[PDB]
Design an enzyme around this catalytic site. Structure first.
Site, short mmCIF file in Angstrom:
data_model
loop_
_atom_site.label_atom_id
_atom_site.label_comp_id
_atom_site.label_asym_id
_atom_site.label_seq_id
_atom_site.Cartn_x
_atom_site.Cartn_y
_atom_site.Cartn_z
N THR A 1 0.80 -1.12 0.00
CA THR A 1 -0.10 0.03 0.00
C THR A 1 1.08 1.39 -0.11
O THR A 1 1.97 1.25 0.43
CB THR A 1 -0.89 -0.06 1.25
N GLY A 2 0.44 2.35 -0.49
CA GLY A 2 1.11 3.48 -0.68
C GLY A 2 2.43 3.54 -1.36
O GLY A 2 3.33 4.26 -0.91
N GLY B 1 2.57 4.05 -4.81
CA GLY B 1 2.33 4.87 -6.03
C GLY B 1 1.43 4.26 -7.19
O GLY B 1 1.53 4.99 -8.25
N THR C 1 -1.86 4.59 -7.83
CA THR C 1 -2.63 5.21 -8.52
C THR C 1 -2.00 6.23 -9.16
O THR C 1 -2.27 6.62 -10.88
CB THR C 1 -3.52 6.17 -7.36
N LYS D 1 -11.86 0.75 -11.30
CA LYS D 1 -11.03 0.51 -9.89
C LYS D 1 -12.19 -0.35 -9.18
O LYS D 1 -13.12 0.05 -8.71
CB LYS D 1 -11.11 1.98 -9.47
N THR E 1 12.73 -3.18 -0.66
CA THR E 1 12.01 -3.51 -2.06
C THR E 1 12.07 -4.74 -2.70
O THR E 1 11.21 -5.24 -3.38
CB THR E 1 12.02 -2.05 -2.80
N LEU E 2 13.40 -5.21 -2.83
CA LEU E 2 13.58 -6.42 -3.62
C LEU E 2 12.93 -7.53 -3.06
O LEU E 2 12.67 -8.31 -3.81
CB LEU E 2 15.10 -6.52 -3.64
N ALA F 1 9.63 11.94 -7.75
CA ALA F 1 8.93 12.22 -6.55
C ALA F 1 8.04 13.45 -6.55
O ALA F 1 8.28 14.50 -7.45
CB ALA F 1 9.86 12.37 -5.26
O1 LIG Z 1 -4.79 1.33 -2.56
C1 LIG Z 1 -3.91 1.75 -1.73
O2 LIG Z 1 -2.82 0.77 -1.42
C2 LIG Z 1 -4.01 2.81 -0.83
C3 LIG Z 1 -5.45 2.81 -0.16
C4 LIG Z 1 -5.88 4.03 0.43
C5 LIG Z 1 -6.69 3.52 1.82
C6 LIG Z 1 -5.86 2.25 2.35
C7 LIG Z 1 -5.13 1.74 1.26
C8 LIG Z 1 -5.76 0.45 0.66
O3 LIG Z 1 -6.85 0.63 -0.07
C9 LIG Z 1 -5.17 -0.86 1.23
C10 LIG Z 1 -4.36 -0.72 1.86
C11 LIG Z 1 -3.76 -2.09 2.75
C12 LIG Z 1 -4.46 -3.36 2.19
C13 LIG Z 1 -5.52 -3.19 1.34
C14 LIG Z 1 -5.93 -1.99 0.92
O4 LIG Z 1 -6.86 -1.96 -0.14
#
Ligand SMILES: O=C(O)C[C@@H]1CCC[C@H]1C(=O)c1ccccc1O
Ligand SMILES: O=C(O)C[C@@H]1CCC[C@H]1C(=O)c1ccccc1O
Lengths: 227, 226
Positions: free
Chosen positions: A12-13, A15, A17, A38, A146-147, A199
């Site tokens: 998650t988080g 990038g 999107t 989505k 990351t690897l 970035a």
């Molecule tokens: O898509 C993303 O990673 C960012 C989203 C934004 C809100 C929480 C994240 C999320 O959805 C998520 C996180 C951990 C596991 C499953 C998930 O679906």
């Protein structure tokens, strides 16, 4: 049909999107018709709307959603918190097949990482990619860790014969350090590094984002995704 | 022989070393003889010595290592920076097999996550576990993203018939919170959650740590490891 690509990530988080917007922008500028879907969106109670963000950044108008949950957690937990159900597998496949058409690039943006449950029971984006015969684009960081995460993800894809379309580094620091430099070199040694978004790309306006997007990917690879 | 367990995790900084010390301590308090093997150590420039943390927190004396790199990177990158190679596969496997003896719990601590390169060429803790017929204990976080990383790691284990000995949550927050509490319930449906260590446990003195560790794990499960 056309070309279906799932856009996933090591977690998650990372990038997902902004990479979805960037590949969509690049493909639009090559004349490719693009749709983005989505299947599961969480975090709507805090304004999360990845489709709306892809429309903003890349100009994509063909945007398709399905399931939406308020809490910013994994879908199963967010659905449970809200008293709602996950969608069924066939509903996600229908969402995707409705968009698929010759000469179109349909991007399927995951939620979290690859093995996140999107439909009951334990149905993931990997299963969906098998169902629609899609390859997977994997969004990664350049950070410590990351690897291992990238190799586990690529192994999970190969286990179900889902082809890997490459990696994209979601945020690339200017300038990089020893770990970032060593990881990018090592990431490029395990799979193709299609791009490495600078970035703060998510803050770029439409014009700068389109310029970044066109510069970020190899124009020839984007064109070869769909005849 | 005895029982060999690799102690891996979903990534870096998830609590692998403190869990190793917690299980060692719990096993020592059950009268089990415990050896810990950390084949490769990085970050020695800033003083990282994971075997020394196990020694102090759990009292283990059979502490076995092969190589120490100054840079706080993955092994291959720290070796590259230092201009020297990583140990060889046989070195790690023979060292572990020599450590193993009946009545003994031998814990093998990797570096970073499961597929991190430990030996030449591109040899991983998973390969090591296959070679010595060890099961794998997986250290996980409670944070957002942990279920994906956990499932990814457990699939990679099953793909080489390395048995999963359970999970341990390296750091359990107080108070939990919605995401952490949801994650613990979901982790329990993926595999046995053997313990969840209170946040900050890495900083306890030896007597407080042995108390926490003896309460953290289930007595019968520990006692049955060997
Ligand atoms: O898509 C993303 O990673 C960012 C989203 C934004 C809100 C929480 C994240 C999320 O959805 C998520 C996180 C951990 C596991 C499953 C998930 O679906
Ligand atoms: O064991 C840890 O994860 C903490 C160590 C402490 C210094 C860097 C970390 C490390 O070793 C590491 C990091 C990324 C990938 C593989 C690795 O082995």
């Amino acid at each position: 049909g056309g070309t279906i690509l799932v856009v996933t990530g090591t977690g998650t988080g990372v990038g997902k999107t902004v990479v979805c917007a960037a590949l969509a922008s690049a493909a639009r500028q090559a004349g490719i018709d693009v749709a983005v879907c989505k299947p599961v969106q969480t975090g709507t109670a805090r304004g999360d709307d990845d489709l709306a963000e892809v429309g903003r950044l890349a100009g994509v108008t063909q945007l398709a959603g399905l399931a939406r949950y308020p809490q910013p957690m994994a879908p199963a937990a967010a659905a449970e918190h809200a008293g709602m159900a996950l969608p069924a597998r066939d509903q996600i496949v229908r969402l995707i097949a409705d968009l698929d058409r010759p000469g179109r690039l349909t991007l399927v943006e995951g939620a979290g990482g690859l093995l996140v449950e999107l439909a009951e029971p334990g149905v993931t984006l990997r299963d969906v990619a098998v169902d629609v015969a899609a390859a997977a684009l994997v969004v990664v960081t350049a950070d410590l860790g990351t690897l291992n995460h990238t190799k586990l993800t690529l192994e999970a894809l190969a286990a179900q014969q889902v082809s890997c379309a490459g990696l994209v580094i979601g945020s690339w620091p200017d300038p990089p350090g020893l770990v970032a430099a060593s990881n990018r070199s090592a990431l490029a040694r395990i799979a193709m590094v299609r791009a490495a978004l600078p970035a703060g790309a998510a803050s770029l306006d439409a014009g700068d984002f389109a310029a970044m997007s066109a510069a970020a990917f190899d124009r020839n690879w984007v064109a070869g995704l769909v005849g």
